[PDB]
Swiss-Prot record, chain A:
The keyword Protease does not apply. The keyword Cytoplasm applies. It comes from the Eukaryota. InterPro entries: Cell_cycle_HUS1, DNA_clamp_sf, Hus1/Mec3. It comes from Homo sapiens. Component of the toroidal 9-1-1 (RAD9-RAD1-HUS1) complex, composed of RAD9A, RAD1 and HUS1. The 9-1-1 complex associates with LIG1, POLB, FEN1, RAD17, HDAC1, RPA1 and RPA2. The 9-1-1 complex associates with the RAD17-RFC complex. HUS1 interacts with POLB, HDAC1, FEN1, PCNA and RAD9B. HUS1 does not interact with RAD17. Interacts with DNAJC7. Component of the 9-1-1 cell-cycle checkpoint response complex that plays a major role in DNA repair. The 9-1-1 complex is recruited to DNA lesion upon damage by the RAD17-replication factor C (RFC) clamp loader complex. Acts then as a sliding clamp platform on DNA for several proteins involved in long-patch base excision repair (LP-BER). This is Checkpoint protein HUS1. GO terms for biological process: cellular response to ionizing radiation; DNA damage checkpoint signaling; DNA damage response; DNA repair; double-strand break repair via homologous recombination; embryo development ending in birth or egg hatching; meiotic DNA integrity checkpoint signaling; mitotic DNA replication checkpoint signaling. The lineage of its organism: Eukaryota, Metazoa, Chordata, Craniata, Vertebrata. The gene is HUS1. Ubiquitous. It is found in: Nucleus; Cytoplasm, Cytosol. Keywords: Cytoplasm, DNA damage, Nucleus.
Curated annotation (Swiss-Prot), chain B:
Signal peptide: none annotated. One of its GO terms (cellular component) is checkpoint clamp complex. Component of the 9-1-1 cell-cycle checkpoint response complex that plays a major role in DNA repair. The 9-1-1 complex is recruited to DNA lesion upon damage by the RAD17-replication factor C (RFC) clamp loader complex. Acts then as a sliding clamp platform on DNA for several proteins involved in long-patch base excision repair (LP-BER). One of its GO terms (biological process) is positive regulation of intrinsic apoptotic signaling pathway in response to DNA damage. The gene is RAD9A. It comes from the Eukaryota. It catalyses: Exonucleolytic cleavage in the 3'- to 5'-direction to yield nucleoside 5'-phosphates. It comes from Homo sapiens. Its main location: nucleus. Its EC number is 3.1.11.2. This is Cell cycle checkpoint control protein RAD9A.
Swiss-Prot record, chain C:
This is Cell cycle checkpoint protein RAD1. InterPro entries: Cell_cycle_checkpoint_Rad1 (IPR003011), DNA_clamp_sf (IPR046938), Rad1_Rec1_Rad17 (IPR003021). The lineage of its organism: Eukaryota, Metazoa, Chordata, Craniata, Vertebrata. Changing F252A: Reduced binding to RHNO1. It is found in: Nucleus. GO terms for cellular component: checkpoint clamp complex; chromosome; intracellular membrane-bounded organelle; nucleoplasm. SUPFAM superfamilies: DNA clamp. Gene3D superfamilies: 3.70.10.10. CDD domains: PCNA. It comes from Homo sapiens. Belongs to the rad1 family.
Length: 258, 254, 261
């Protein structure tokens, strides 16, 4: 197995860190799929699943890997990566490279520049867990069938504030979406009932779900900026699929019910 | 005792007390002919620190050593000194009076336990290895490490360059390693290959105080086992830390 | 109907309530003058929040006086449901409705077109003590600024099961004291201080109130501009806070507390 990436562009470097901070809040342990074309953060279990598409040729300046089957499935703790990328903010260059000194790791070498002529270097050895070809099939992108309703999602900031306050009421939550772009958030206890009504949400090309508010709140927390694409695909049965595409980074989130 | 700390020196005293908090749970006081000595010791007797305050104000004694709960004396400086004057005297009870603004006064009657002094065997001049660099630099050298990191190893790699490496005792942990050039140091007198391991959380306590004062910190270490000696000196301020170093069979006890 | 209260700025209601939020539940008392929410604890402390009908953009009370106990926590969560960080320009509208008895309290909020409807059930066991704190039998009275007391109450909390308040025309003009494990800490307030607006101390008085009962006062202290610390013959304490709305109109919040024998 081979893997050597390298980032130099500031905008990309910082933006890459943002992505790690996000996934660190959506999953304690994730799976990193290394493809010659793109990178992916995957996980599946509460049976929530996450799929993060990332165009490699849009972040790194130098990139190369080796699988016949050019592809690598690594299992790492999200926290370890984020902390490793935290010091790469005011950094000059970033070099992530698959290693195996003491044990299979993902070395994240960082070059920090300063008023000193001598270059500062910080290396992180992220413990890795290579997944056999046997499970390669169970870590593929989740399937999005025929959404009973496909409505555009309101500003996440507002939706988040509402979910926050509703969590202090009940652990359950009913999300409803119509055709005239009407998204509703309903919580009901034997003492207090709260219902929020959104309207005018497009959906060019009713469905209720009883998911727990605790996991819905997790999804809205990871987002620190308004996505350039917010779709809420609902299946009246027991599924809520969120499709985001901020810039060139795709994010798919799935939340079951019952 | 008769102390009258004013101006920025008040905050400096506070910062000093805060540093002695991240190492010990009891503050040892001891007025001397050269200044005010604030000392402390680790619960496991594997760490010691001391701040000598040569006339940073208006000192005077007799008309005296003692010991208070570090956290009690800390609450007085936690945010209360956020204060133009500070009088530390003795009644009867360590009295710490704060002459705040608008006229508001904050007197502190702190009970304590009169005991003996805290001596300890050091010898930086006899310490084989040595290095000296701006605190600001060392503070940057520890940034890559997690705040929860307990132990870190300071070593000298081939090429005359210092290297801080994370220490740990199939859930493998991430090993962080910071490497600094010789040019970052004002002095580097250490043998290549030699490396010691000490407490980071305690080392930060001193480093945080040396940074805010913009001062230079010098480390004196020997062989794995014998304590490491950290030193900082100011125009009218003195302080030094001493931490235990791991070994082979032992578990870092001194 | 029975009780309708429109409001263009929910904060005119939610903000003042937060200063009385040291208990899960609260009693509401609405007349023609306005609304009055009261929260008490240990039957030794009581916080009163008054909101004259002048503040509202549409107040209405049917027949006599309407009362109902309710969950303050849930209420506050509902009011600030659209987040508690709106920037200068955005406002949330409120319409409160309560139908006498057996009916739940209705809340209607809206921001940027987004409307939310809350249904909080009313639960009225009540039983509320009456502090006979009259002005006719007041010994000492002091009116200082709220900023100065910020660092006071905040860093005040100790292992001390009490807070000694002493007001006197002599040496210690106004001293707050505590006595815990650490020892004893005193906080003085010299007369003729710019922090001191009014000063009317007839005779030296020393009272001790369970500090755990005056701590929640900060919710109003940091929220007010002025505070009228008052003490009567029985030893009861009276903390009166001036809280100005985001429209300018002033409001009141009063804390009562029994001494410690």
């Amino acid at each position: 197995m081979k893997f050597r990436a390298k980032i130099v562009d500031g905008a990309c470097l910082n933006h890459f860190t943002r992505i790690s901070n996000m996934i660190a809040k959506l999953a304690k342990t994730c799976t990193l799929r290394i493809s010659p074309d793109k990178l992916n953060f995957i996980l599946c279990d509460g049976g929530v699943s996450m799929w993060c598409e990332l165009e490699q040729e849009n972040f790194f300046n130098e990139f190369q890997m080796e699988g016949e089957n050019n592809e690598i499935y690594l299992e790492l703790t999200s926290e370890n990566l984020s902390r490793a990328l935290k010091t790469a903010q005011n950094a000059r260059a970033l070099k992530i490279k698959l290693t195996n000194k003491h044990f299979p790791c993902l070395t994240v070498s960082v070059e920090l520049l300063s008023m000193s002529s001598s270059s500062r270097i910080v290396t992180h050895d992220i413990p890795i867990k290579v997944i056999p070809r046997k499970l390669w099939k169970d870590l593929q992108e989740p399937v999005v069938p025929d959404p009973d309703v496909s409505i555009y999602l309101p500003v996440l900031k507002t939706m988040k504030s509402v979910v926050e306050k509703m969590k202090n009421i009940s652990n359950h939550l009913v999300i409803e979406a119509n055709l005239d772009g009407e998204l509703n958030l309903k919580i009901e206890t034997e003492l207090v009932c709260v219902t929020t009504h959104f309207k005018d949400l497009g959906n060019p090309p009713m469905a209720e779900v009883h998911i727990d508010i605790r996991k819905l709140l997790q999804f809205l927390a990871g987002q620190q900026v308004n996505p350039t694409k917010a779709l809420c695909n609902i299946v009246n049965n027991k599924m809520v699929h969120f499709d985001l595409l901020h810039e060139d980074v795709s994010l798919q989130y799935f939340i079951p019910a019952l | 005792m008769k102390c009258l700390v004013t101006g920025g020196n008040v905050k400096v005293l506070g910062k000093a007390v805060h540093s002695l908090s991240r190492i010990g749970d009891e503050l040892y006081l001891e007025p001397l002919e050269d200044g005010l000595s604030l000392r402390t010791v680790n619960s496991s007797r594997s760490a010691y620190a001391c701040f000598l305050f040569a006339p940073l104000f208006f000192q005077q004694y007799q008309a005296l050593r003692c010991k208070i709960l570090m956290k009690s004396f800390l609450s007085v400086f936690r945010s209360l000194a956020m204060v133009e004057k500070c009088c530390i005297s003795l009644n009867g009870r360590l009295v710490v009076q704060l002459h705040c603004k608008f006229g508001v006064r904050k007197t502190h009657n702190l009970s304590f336990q009169d005991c003996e002094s805290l001596q300890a065997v050091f010898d930086p001049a006899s310490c084989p290895h040595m290095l000296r660099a701006p605190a600001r630099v060392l503070g940057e050298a520890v940034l890559p490490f997690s705040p929860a990191l307990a132990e870190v190893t300071l070593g000298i790699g081939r090429g005359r360059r210092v290297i801080l490496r994370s220490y740990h005792e199939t859930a493998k942990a991430m090993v962080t390693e910071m490497c600094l050039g010789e040019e970052d140091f004002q002095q580097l007198q250490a043998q290549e290959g030699v490396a010691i391991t000490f407490c980071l959380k305690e080392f930060r306590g001193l480093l945080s105080f040396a940074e805010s004062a913009n001062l230079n910190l010098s480390i004196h270490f020997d062989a794995p086992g014998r304590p490491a000696i950290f030193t900082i000196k100011d125009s009218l301020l003195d302080g030094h830390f001493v931490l235990a170093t791991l070994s082979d069979t032992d578990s870092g006890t001194t | 109907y029975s009780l309708v209260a429109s409001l263009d700025n929910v904060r005119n209601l939610s903000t003042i309530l937060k200063a009385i939020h040291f208990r899960e539940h609260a009693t509401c008392f609405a007349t023609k003058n306005g609304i009055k929410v009261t929260v008490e604890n240990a039957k030794c402390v009581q916080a009163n929040a008054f909101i004259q009908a002048g503040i509202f953009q549409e107040f209405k009370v049917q027949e006599e006086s309407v009362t109902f106990r309710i969950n303050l926590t849930v209420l506050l969560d509902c009011l600030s449901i659209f987040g508690s960080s709106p920037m200068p320009g955005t406002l949330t509208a409120l319409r409160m409705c309560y139908q006498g008895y057996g009916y739940p309290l209705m809340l209607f909020l809206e921001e940027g077109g987004v409307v939310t409807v809350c249904k909080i059930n009313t639960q009225e066991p009540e039983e509320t003590l009456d502090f006979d704190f009259c002005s006719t039998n007041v010994i000492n009275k002091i009116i200082l600024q709220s900023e100065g007391l910020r660092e006071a109450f905040s860093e005040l909390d100790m292992t001390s099961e009490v807070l000694q308040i002493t007001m006197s025309p002599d040496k210690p003009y106004f001293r707050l004291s505590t006595f815990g494990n650490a020892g004893s800490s005193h906080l003085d307030y010299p007369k003729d201080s710019d922090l001191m607006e009014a000063f009317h101390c007839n005779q030296t008085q020393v009272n001790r109130y369970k500090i755990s009962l005056l701590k929640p006062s900060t919710k109003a202290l940091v929220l007010s501009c002025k505070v009228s610390i008052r003490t009567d013959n029985r030893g009861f304490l009276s903390l009166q806070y001036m809280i100005r709305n985001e429209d300018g109109q002033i409001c009141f919040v009063e804390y009562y507390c029994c001494p410690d024998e």
